[PDB]
Every structure is written in structure tokens, then in C-alpha cells.
């Protein structure tokens, strides 16, 4: 695996990122806190979004053009994608009332952190533009990268607004949980930043700035993003937290999950009433009742059939839109998403 | 007053900003929520930071160069400074546990908003870069403006970290409340975004990009920022909430206020013990005890003498560093700050 090898080399570069971001004695205490925020929240994941930048860069740039400075800028932009994700996740954990992430308690759940995590999240986002300035300022793709990260943040935030508006706390929202609504939330809240952003960053760094090539890449990557969020929704309830590193909250949070959308399409009038009575509530027995209904409607089997259909669809889109990019750019990512 | 006239003309342009930011039917609901966030949080203030952009622009640019498009870009950048402030304040109200702002309950205290305000704050920040792209993309100062707003956000966030680290909830922190600590917090948390950012934005728009001229402007503006935060700290306890539009929380939040720093410099060993026992706690009787101690040490009189000394100092800095900029750029702002 092209990711599995480059993984340890990627993590080894974190130490330099922290040193450069921690490099005015008056702000000493604030800088020591930023280092703590970085070390707790940006390290511990699979680093698939950040590694995608590095792997795509090595596949798109001519090896004679892959000098020490060029590769350093590639790893740094990969770490900017990981920082963007860390910004979103620190805040998403507060708004989703989550307990754990990447095998440890959520940063905001830590004694002595609490709602100060809001500012900590904003500092993580600020660090992206600090790194882009320090390493890419004199490059011709500088403005393209800045605008890509800003645009990806706007899209994600619009997606999170849709996610939160469809999931009001204390209100029965089954009418809102439609396939059309689900597809819009997922496109904006995760597909852009998770798949389009790292490949587009590598494309701009390789000097591929054409509107058509970015549109063709986006066509594959947004569909891959849709499947990744469906899988994330499935694992929220049916995944092993020792593997996922987090505890699911979608049922309690009244979320427009892929699971609830599939339930509503297959439920009898009686089964709809069970869902209405038990969904979007904090009671453990009500959550268990929803999971029992999902297993009764064979939703894990419906998911298994969907993964197969989605995989074939994404492969047909790679055949249609990959050119002139090497298909291996999209196949490597598809190998990581589909298990 | 050059601000008092241009105030109504500034507010009249908000309608266009909202229309352009609310201009894909799938994200309809999210866009309707963004409009609600903008209308609740960006309108209702004095608009002094946003007006500073417009007034400084008209004073720095030749009237023959002040065309309809140029002025439209000036009002828009003024509204970007107001959006940046709205982003910081929506989040600062959550972390300071505030109740009201600009005469109404804090956005997060609204029933049905709560911690979703975290995402709402992030959308306000995203809107800045949406407006810069839509109006300033083809201008030579585009990258300078983007970098100025990003740098101002980083500085402010570093300042807020320092503010929160010096004010731990549940801990007696009087040792930390020094003049040197206070001056660092204030420089970063408010002075850059409140005074340096709007003048620098107008300077870049007028084609004044020289390192020396920006350094000379900053020398005046950061000192003005220091006084504005001291006045804000004084009004937190001794101001009229019908005038300030907000309720003070500095004593309850264990903040390193200018007032507590002055108290600690003038307190007898007995008075220090009263402060230690009553500061940084939510009990109304303990807050009242701290205010009684402040009035006993004549801190409102100490503030009155400070405003006079600060005013003379800022005027001496205008005489020293204003040139070649018209002194009226700094005098107009000084007239607004000093009451
Ligand atoms: N997309 C952000 C984070 C998530 O994927 P996560 O499962 O919390 O990591 P969400 O389900 O809240 O959308
Ligand atoms: N500077 C941000 C907001 C304040 O000025 P405000 O008094 O809450 O408006 P703070 O005192 O929290 O610093
Ligand atoms: Mg979540
Ligand atoms: Mg979420
Ligand atoms: Mg999830
Ligand atoms: Mg405050
Ligand atoms: Mg504050
Ligand atoms: Mg205050």
C-alpha cells in the first residue's frame, strides 16, 4: 500500500510542523497551549486526508521536479489538511455532544478545557494559513491554495448548518429525513474537505489549475465522499469503538443518518411509530429500540449491498473522468475508503 | 463628526451585503439561517471599526480615484471588519458566559441556538473571504487584504488564549495579574483587529503597502487599542448597561482586568485577602465585595487620571509617527475612543 509506507514518514514530519508553529516571549504561555492543542488533536488518527496530498503530489509531479523543498511543501500542505480536519472535529464534538474521539476523551470533555476548546479549534484553523505563508508564499499556486482552503471551510460550515438544522434537539424530525436532504448535507459537510480538497491541493501544487480537470476530479471525489459519510453513519451504530476510536451519538442527536433514511423507506406504519417515539432522545432503552428496528429491517445487509453498488459506480466514474490524470490517484484512495 | 454622517450610509449598504451573501436550492435552509445569524449579530453596534475603513479610505484616496466601484469595495471591506468582530464576539460570549450584547440576549443564549452558535460564528468568518473574493479578486491589494484579515484573526486568537489561561475558573490567580501580563493580553486580543486592521485595510486599498508606513501607523494604533481595552474593562463594572448594551462578567470570570491589576498595586495586605477571597466567583455578594474594594481604592478616579495621561500620550505619538499620512486619520479615531 502506497499510504502504509509513507504513513511513518508523514508522522515524522509533525515534529517540524510543531517546532515551526511554536518558533516574542510575552505569548510564551499561549504558544505552549497551542503545542498542547496540536499534540492532543492533530495526532492519533489514520492521516488519510493528509497522506492523500503527499501520495497525489508524488504521482502528479515529475520526479526530477520533486526536490527536497518541493516535497517539504507537499508534507506541510498535507499537515494543513489534517489541521483543517482537527479544527472541524474539535468543534463538531462540542455541537454533537460527543464523548470520545481517536480512542481518548474529546478535547472539550477534558477537565480544565471545556468551552475554551472553541478558541483552541480556531487556533488550529489559523495554523493552516501560518504554514501556507511560511512554506508556499513565493510559489505560483499560493493564492490558489489559500482560496481552496477558505472555500473548503465555507462548504463544510454550510454542510454543518444543514446537518444541525435537520437535527433539532427535542423535536421529532422524521419528515425532514429524505434521501434528497441526506445527499445535500453529505456533499457539503464532508465530501469537499475529505476528498476534493487534498487532491485539488496536490493538483494546484503540480501546476494543474484547469477548470475542466478540477471539475472532472470533483465528479469522482464527491461521489467517493458520499460513500465515506454513509459508511461513517453505518459505523456510528454498527462499528466497533475499539476500531472507530469514537462512540456513536447519531440516534440521540436526532441526526439525518443514512440509517434513519433507509429505515423510513422500508418501515411499516407500525415501525414508523416506534421510530417516532424513540428517535432523537438520550434514553439508552429508546436508542436500543431504534437499533433493534434497524436490525429487524436488515439495514446492515442493505449497507453491504450499497457498498458493492457504490464501489462499482465509483470505478465506472474513474473510467469516465480520471483522464488525463493517472487512474492510480483515484484507485489508491478508493482502496483506502472501501474495506 | 466624519463618522456620524457616514454611519447611516454605511448601515444602508448592509442590505446589499446580506443579498449578495444570500444569492443552489439544496442549501436554501442553511442560507436562510446565515441571513438570520448576520441580521442578529452584525447589526446593532456603533460600527466604529467598519466606518474607520470607509473614513480612512476617503481621506487616503484622491477624490478623482474614488469611483462608484472603488467606494463600493471600501464599504464592503468595512463590513468585512464588522463580520470579523461578529465572529469573535459570538464565540467570546460563549467562553465568557455572557448574558447580553448590544442590548439583547447573546445569540447562544437564544432558545434553539445554544452551542450551534459555534458553527454560526465560523460562518460569519467565512463570509469575509466570500466578500473579498466577490469584490476585490481582480484588485492589486487582494492578497494583502486576505493576509491582513488572516493575520488579525491569528493575533486575536493568541490574545484570547492568553486571556483564558490567565483567568482559570475555580483557581485563585492574583499572582498572574501583573501590568506586564495585562499589556500583552490587550495588545493581541483587541488592539490589532480593532484599530490596526481597519486603517491597514484602507492603507492597502489606497496603495500604501510600505513596511515603514505600516509600522509607524501600528505604533499609534496599538497604543490606542490598549486604551480602548482599559476603558472596556473599566465600563465592565462601572459603565451603564443601557449605554454599553452588555452586562459585565470580568470579576465572576476571574479575568486579568485593568481594574484588578490597579487594585493589586494599591491594596494593603488586608485588602489583598478580601480580593483573594471574593474574586473569580459567581456569588453576587462576593462580586459586590470586590466592587466595594475598587471604590474604596478610588479606582474610578485612577481611571479618569489614566484617560487624561493616555490621551496626551496618543497625541504625542500622532505628532511623532502620523507623517506622511494626514493626522486627521488618527484624530478622528481618537475623538471616537476618548469620551
Ligand atoms: N463530518 C464531521 C464528523 C463526523 O463524521 P463524526 O462521526 O463525528 O466523526 P459527523 O458524523 O458528526 O458528521
Ligand atoms: N475583546 C473581546 C470582547 C470584550 O472586549 P467584551 O467586553 O465581552 O465585549 P472582552 O472584555 O471579553 O475582551
Ligand atoms: Mg460528529
Ligand atoms: Mg457532526
Ligand atoms: Mg459520524
Ligand atoms: Mg467578553
Ligand atoms: Mg473575552
Ligand atoms: Mg470586556
Curated annotation (Swiss-Prot), chains A, B:
<feature type="binding site">
    <location>
        <position position="92"/>
    </location>
    <ligand>
        <name>Mg(2+) 2</name>
    </ligand>
</feature>
<dbReference type="GO" id="GO:0005737">
    <property type="term" value="C:cytoplasm"/>
</dbReference>
<keyword id="KW-0153">Cholesterol metabolism</keyword>
<feature type="binding site">
    <location>
        <position position="246"/>
    </location>
    <ligand>
        <name>dimethylallyl diphosphate</name>
    </ligand>
</feature>
<keyword id="KW-0808">Transferase</keyword>
<keyword id="KW-0225">Disease variant</keyword>
<comment type="similarity">
    <text>Belongs to the FPP/GGPP synthase family.</text>
</comment>
<feature type="binding site">
    <location>
        <position position="102"/>
    </location>
    <ligand>
        <name>isopentenyl diphosphate</name>
    </ligand>
</feature>
<comment type="pathway">
    <text>Isoprenoid biosynthesis; geranyl diphosphate biosynthesis; geranyl diphosphate from dimethylallyl diphosphate and isopentenyl diphosphate: step 1/1.</text>
</comment>
<dbReference type="GO" id="GO:0003723">
    <property type="term" value="F:RNA binding"/>
</dbReference>
<feature type="binding site">
    <location>
        <position position="101"/>
    </location>
    <ligand>
        <name>dimethylallyl diphosphate</name>
    </ligand>
</feature>
<keyword id="KW-0752">Steroid biosynthesis</keyword>
<feature type="binding site">
    <location>
        <position position="49"/>
    </location>
    <ligand>
        <name>isopentenyl diphosphate</name>
    </ligand>
</feature>
<dbReference type="GO" id="GO:0005759">
    <property type="term" value="C:mitochondrial matrix"/>
</dbReference>
<dbReference type="GO" id="GO:0005777">
    <property type="term" value="C:peroxisome"/>
</dbReference>
<keyword id="KW-0379">Hydroxylation</keyword>
<feature type="binding site">
    <location>
        <position position="189"/>
    </location>
    <ligand>
        <name>dimethylallyl diphosphate</name>
    </ligand>
</feature>
<keyword id="KW-0756">Sterol biosynthesis</keyword>
<feature type="binding site">
    <location>
        <position position="92"/>
    </location>
    <ligand>
        <name>Mg(2+) 1</name>
    </ligand>
</feature>
<dbReference type="GO" id="GO:0004337">
    <property type="term" value="F:(2E,6E)-farnesyl diphosphate synthase activity"/>
</dbReference>
<keyword id="KW-0444">Lipid biosynthesis</keyword>
<dbReference type="GO" id="GO:0004161">
    <property type="term" value="F:dimethylallyltranstransferase activity"/>
</dbReference>
<feature type="binding site">
    <location>
        <position position="85"/>
    </location>
    <ligand>
        <name>isopentenyl diphosphate</name>
    </ligand>
</feature>
<feature type="site" description="Important for determining product chain length">
    <location>
        <position position="88"/>
    </location>
</feature>
<feature type="binding site">
    <location>
        <position position="190"/>
    </location>
    <ligand>
        <name>dimethylallyl diphosphate</name>
    </ligand>
</feature>
<keyword id="KW-0479">Metal-binding</keyword>
<keyword id="KW-0963">Cytoplasm</keyword>
<feature type="modified residue" description="N6-acetyllysine; alternate">
    <location>
        <position position="46"/>
    </location>
</feature>
<keyword id="KW-0007">Acetylation</keyword>
<feature type="binding site">
    <location>
        <position position="96"/>
    </location>
    <ligand>
        <name>Mg(2+) 1</name>
    </ligand>
</feature>
<dbReference type="GO" id="GO:0005654">
    <property type="term" value="C:nucleoplasm"/>
</dbReference>
<comment type="pathway">
    <text>Isoprenoid biosynthesis; farnesyl diphosphate biosynthesis; farnesyl diphosphate from geranyl diphosphate and isopentenyl diphosphate: step 1/1.</text>
</comment>
<feature type="modified residue" description="N6-acetyllysine">
    <location>
        <position position="276"/>
    </location>
</feature>
<comment type="function">
    <text>Key enzyme in isoprenoid biosynthesis which catalyzes the formation of farnesyl diphosphate (FPP), a precursor for several classes of essential metabolites including sterols, dolichols, carotenoids, and ubiquinones. FPP also serves as substrate for protein farnesylation and geranylgeranylation. Catalyzes the sequential condensation of isopentenyl pyrophosphate with the allylic pyrophosphates, dimethylallyl pyrophosphate, and then with the resultant geranylpyrophosphate to the ultimate product farnesyl pyrophosphate.</text>
</comment>
<keyword id="KW-0945">Host-virus interaction</keyword>
<keyword id="KW-0443">Lipid metabolism</keyword>
<keyword id="KW-0152">Cholesterol biosynthesis</keyword>
<feature type="binding site">
    <location>
        <position position="229"/>
    </location>
    <ligand>
        <name>dimethylallyl diphosphate</name>
    </ligand>
</feature>
<dbReference type="GO" id="GO:0045337">
    <property type="term" value="P:farnesyl diphosphate biosynthetic process"/>
</dbReference>
<feature type="binding site">
    <location>
        <position position="46"/>
    </location>
    <ligand>
        <name>isopentenyl diphosphate</name>
    </ligand>
</feature>
<protein>
    <recommendedName>
        <fullName>Farnesyl pyrophosphate synthase</fullName>
        <ecNumber>2.5.1.10</ecNumber>
        <ecNumber>2.5.1.1</ecNumber>
    </recommendedName>
</protein>
<comment type="subunit">
    <text>Homodimer. Interacts with RSAD2.</text>
</comment>
Amino acid at each position: 500500500d502506497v499510504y502504509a509506507q509513507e504513513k511513518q514518514d508523514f508522522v515524522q514530519h509533525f515534529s517540524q510542523i510543531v517546532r515551526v508553529l511554536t518558533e516574542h516571549p510575552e505569548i510564551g504561555d499561549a504558544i505552549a497551549r497551542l503545542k498542547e492543542v496540536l499534540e492532543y488533536n492533530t495526532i492519533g488518527g489514520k492521516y488519510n486526508r493528509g497522506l492523500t496530498v503527499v501520495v497525489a503530489f508524488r504521482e502528479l509531479v515529475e520526479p526530477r521536479k520533486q526536490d527536497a523543498d518541493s516535497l517539504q511543501r507537499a508534507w506541510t500542505v498535507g499537515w494543513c489538511v489534517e489541521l483543517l480536519q482537527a479544527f472541524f472535529l474539535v468543534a463538531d464534538d462540542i455541537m454533537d455532544s460527543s464523548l470520545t474521539r481517536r480512542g481518548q476523551i474529546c478535547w472539550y470533555q477534558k477537565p480544565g478545557v471545556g468551552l475554551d476548546a472553541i478558541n483552541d479549534a480556531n487556533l488550529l484553523e489559523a495554523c493552516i494559513y501560518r504554514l501556507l505563508k511560511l512554506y508556499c508564499r513565493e510559489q505560483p499556486y499560493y493564492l490558489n491554495l489559500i482560496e481552496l482552503f477558505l472555500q473548503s471551510s465555507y462548504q463544510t460550515e454550510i454542510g454543518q448548518t444543514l446537518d444541525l438544522l435537520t437535527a433539532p434537539q427535542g423535536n421529532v424530525d422524521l419528515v425532514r429525513f429524505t434521501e434528497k436532504r441526506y445527499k445535500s448535507i453529505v456533499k457539503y459537510k464532508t465530501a469537499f474537505y475529505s476528498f476534493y480538497l487534498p487532491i485539488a491541493a496536490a493538483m494546484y501544487m503540480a501546476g494543474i489549475d484547469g477548470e475542466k480537470e478540477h471539475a472532472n476530479a470533483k465528479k469522482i471525489l464527491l461521489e467517493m465522499g458520499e460513500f465515506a459519510q454513509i459508511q461513517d453513519d453505518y459505523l456510528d451504530l454498527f462499528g466497533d469503538p475499539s476500531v472507530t476510536g469514537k462512540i456513536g451519538t447519531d440516534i440521540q442527536d436526532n441526526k439525518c443518518s443514512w440509517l434513519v433514511v433507509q429505515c423510513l423507506q422500508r418501515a411499516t406504519p407500525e415501525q414508523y411509530q416506534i421510530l417516532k417515539e424513540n428517535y432523537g432522545q438520550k434514553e439508552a432503552e429508546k436508542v436500543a429500540r431504534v437499533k433493534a428496528l434497524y436490525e429487524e429491517l436488515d439495514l446492515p445487509a442493505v449497507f453491504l449491498q450499497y457498498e458493492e453498488d457504490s464501489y462499482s459506480h465509483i470505478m465506472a466514474l474513474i473510467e469516465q473522468y480520471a483522464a488525463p490524470l493517472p487512474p492510480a490517484v483515484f484507485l489508491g484512495l478508493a482502496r483506502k475508503i472501501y474495506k
